[PDB]
Design a protein around this nucleic acid. Structure first.
Ligand SMILES: [Mg+2]
Ligand SMILES: [Mg+2]
Ligand SMILES: [Mg+2]
Ligand SMILES: [Mg+2]
Ligand SMILES: [Mg+2]
Ligand SMILES: [Mg+2]
Ligand SMILES: [Mg+2]
Lengths: 55, 149, 271, 77, 100
RNA sequence: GUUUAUUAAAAACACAGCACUGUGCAAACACGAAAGUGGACGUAUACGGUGUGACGCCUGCCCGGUGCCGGAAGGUUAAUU
């Protein structure tokens, strides 16, 4: 359902260092986190998001 | 060895000056060219005989070279075609030979060895600036338009 | 495929064959052959300038197109056939204009496959392009060293060359030996590796097999007399000497390259 | 035929003496080099096998003068 | 006959020529009886991290419905095309037309 | 299989296999004052040299000495000046 091109929402689920926030913090459901993890990893490949704050 | 210059030289001297140069420089470059000849009493007196003529002869050729230089600049743009692939990247190349022929085609006779391409050999489609060195002290410019269907 | 011979007799126990059913079973292309009389290691003075050469099966040379200057004309692989002059196989290709030539068979080429040579040819195995057009990192064989001279690198059965990098007018190549060398980008190269990669797995199995391909026995230096070889004699098995060639030059470590002309193209040696 | 075409220098024989004065026969070869000389009088290059000393003779005497001597001697160039 | 979503990155120096790429690619999909459902030219944008010493690239988003063979050679075009970098293709169970 | 033709046929030589090492092509190497020729109309799955000697299980410790390879700061050091 959730799409990786929507970077604005993904910014809320990544820390300042680019880490993917844990589910227990955000409180998202398990199914959506798996989609979320794929989306963030996929944006990183396209450089829509940074892998880490150091480059 | 000691030689006297028959033509202007950048870092060596002007016409008529007797200068000392390496044997290799004179034997391999100056003497084979018309720039200088060995400086001996036989040549010095003989050189003095046409001292005025050589200076006058050299003066007009620079003007003559300049005269043919401006008309080269008149053809500000020249159109050529080559094997151009996708992205405009030319599969082949357009060297001094192709450019030399193009300028003469419906233009002015141009030597194939005095064209200057500092950037490269124009391996990509587009517009490039090619400099021309027609005489030692004068330069010329022209734009080469390269495109293909 | 590689098949072992059953030990029905000594000399066949260890024989391992490399059988390729795809190779043409008939005679080669007649108008593209020529005489290949053997030499036996003798030079124009009649002296043996290279030992352990002589005899073997008669062979006829067949002209292989190492240059591939037929630009823009596609060709179809008619068949693959045996070539006694080299480890690799040669593919007979028919240009649709009506010309026939031999080329080194790439790794995957088969009868009926299309090939093309030229600057605008597609990036596909068997095609020949200048290395300035081939993508960096591509695996190529039959690599040229001077433009228009013909391929001279990676001609063996399973050899290939990798284009590690390109800059200026030169392309850096990693040769099969591990050496990295510079070559002009205008030189031509053939995409893909040479076929018959299973050539190294064959085992001759017997002395006669070596003789069939013109290799004569090699006599150990230590088995000679002092007058014949530096390793010389000595009653019993005595060596007591640093290994050397028959002419006294040390072996097992001593370098021999002395070409000051071509070091500018050698970015790094094999090791 | 390591013979200079201008000066006629040819290899000569001699000995090399060691610290113990052992004499072994040797040769002294001329410093020959194939060089192209432009004949101003003929608008062309002429190739000659000349020694380094012969090269200096060309400068002092001129290429035109020496070729006359080579022609007179019968040397082909 | 499967849907696909294709995002390919073009070199900034070839930004002006990007529209040339789209027409050629769409022709290949259409020429093989395929169709394009979405097509966006996002233009120049800032890269999150450098890519081959490059900080800004031209972005193109294209969603198509083409057979396997059409996409196969399309990938090969990206591979050997130096102008385009870091291209990916998707599989989707339905066509998409929203801007997103 | 080969060998001391004419006192030695063997455990000797060769051998397939194995390992080290050299060689990027005008290859190393070898015959040649040189040209040139072989290696090879071959191109590192190739070629030369060396040792070992099918195959099976294996091949341990030592780099001080000699050799080879790599290094270059320092010491010593030729012609030349
Ligand atoms: Mg041998
Ligand atoms: Mg052996
Ligand atoms: Mg003995
Ligand atoms: Mg003993
Ligand atoms: Mg017997
Ligand atoms: Mg006997
Ligand atoms: Mg033994």
């Amino acid at each position: 359902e959730i799409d990786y091109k929507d970077i604005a929402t993904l910014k809320n689920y990544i820390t300042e260092s680019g880490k993917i926030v844990p589910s227990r913090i955000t409180g998202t459901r398990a199914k959506y986190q798996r989609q979320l993890a794929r989306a963030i990893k996929r944006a990183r490949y396209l450089s829509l998001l940074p892998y880490t704050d150091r480059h | 060895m000691q030689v006297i210059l028959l033509d202007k030289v950048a870092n060596l001297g002007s016409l008529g000056d007797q200068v000392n140069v390496k044997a290799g420089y004179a034997r391999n470059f100056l003497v084979p060219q018309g720039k200088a000849v060995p400086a001996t009493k036989k040549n010095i007196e003989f050189f003095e005989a046409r001292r005025a003529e050589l200076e006058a002869k050299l003066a007009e050729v620079l003007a003559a070279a300049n005269a043919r230089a401006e008309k080269i600049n008149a053809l500000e743009t020249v159109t050529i075609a080559s094997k151009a692939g996708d992205e405009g990247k030319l599969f082949g190349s357009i060297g001094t030979r192709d450019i030399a022929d193009a300028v003469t085609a419906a233009g002015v006779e141009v030597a194939k060895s005095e064209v200057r391409l500092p950037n490269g050999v124009l391996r990509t489609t587009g517009e490039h600036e090619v400099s021309f060195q027609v005489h030692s002290e004068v330069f010329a410019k022209v734009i080469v338009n390269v495109v293909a269907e | 495929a590689v098949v072992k011979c059953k030990p029905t007799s000594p000399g066949r126990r260890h024989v391992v064959k490399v059988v390729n059913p795809e190779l043409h079973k008939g005679k080669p292309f007649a108008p593209l052959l020529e005489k290949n009389s053997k030499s036996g290691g003798r030079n124009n003075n009649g002296r043996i300038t290279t030992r352990h050469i002589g005899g073997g099966h008669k062979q006829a040379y067949r002209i292989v197109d190492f240059k591939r200057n037929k630009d823009g004309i596609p060709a179809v692989v008619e068949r693959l056939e045996y070539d006694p002059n080299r480890s690799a196989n040669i593919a007979l290709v028919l240009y649709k204009d009506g010309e026939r030539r031999y080329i080194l068979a790439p790794k995957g080429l088969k009868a009926g496959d299309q090939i093309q040579s030229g600057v605008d040819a597609a990036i596909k195995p068997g095609n020949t392009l200048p290395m300035r057009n081939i993508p960096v990192g591509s695996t190529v064989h039959n690599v040229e060293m001077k433009p228009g001279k013909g391929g001279q690198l990676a001609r063996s059965a399973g050899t290939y060359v990798q284009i590690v990098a390109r800059d200026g007018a030169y392309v850096t190549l990693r040769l099969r030996s591990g050496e990295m060398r510079k070559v002009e980008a205008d030189c031509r190269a053939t995409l893909g590796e040479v076929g018959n990669a299973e050539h190294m797995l064959r085992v001759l199995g017997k002395a006669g097999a070596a003789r069939w391909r013109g290799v004569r026995p090699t006599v150990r230096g230590t088995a000679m007399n002092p007058v014949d070889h530096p390793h010389g004699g000595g009653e019993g098995r005595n060596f007591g000497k640093h290994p050397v060639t028959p002419w006294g030059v040390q072996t097992k470590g001593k370098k021999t390259r002395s070409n000051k002309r071509t070091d500018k193209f050698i970015v790094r040696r094999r090791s | 035929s390591r013979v200079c075409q201008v000066t006629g220098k040819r290899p000569v024989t001699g000995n090399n003496r060691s610290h113990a004065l052992n004499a072994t026969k040797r040769r002294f070869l001329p410093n020959l080099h194939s060089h192209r000389f432009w004949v101003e009088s003929e608008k062309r290059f002429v190739t000659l096998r000349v020694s380094a000393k012969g090269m200096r003779v060309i400068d002092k005497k001129g290429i035109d003068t020496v070729l006359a001597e080579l022609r007179a001697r019968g040397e082909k160039y | 006959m499967r849907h696909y979503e294709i995002v390919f990155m073009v070199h900034p120096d070839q930004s002006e020529q990007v529209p040339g790429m789209i027409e050629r690619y769409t022709a290949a999909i259409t020429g093989a009886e395929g169709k394009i459902h979405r097509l966006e030219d996002w233009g120049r944008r800032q890269l999150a991290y450098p890519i081959n010493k490059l900080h800004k690239a031209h972005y193109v988003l294209m969603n198509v419905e083409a057979p396997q063979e059409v996409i196969d050679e399309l990938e090969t075009t990206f591979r050997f095309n130096d102008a385009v970098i870091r291209s990916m293709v998707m599989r989707t169970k339905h066509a998409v037309t929203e801007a997103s």
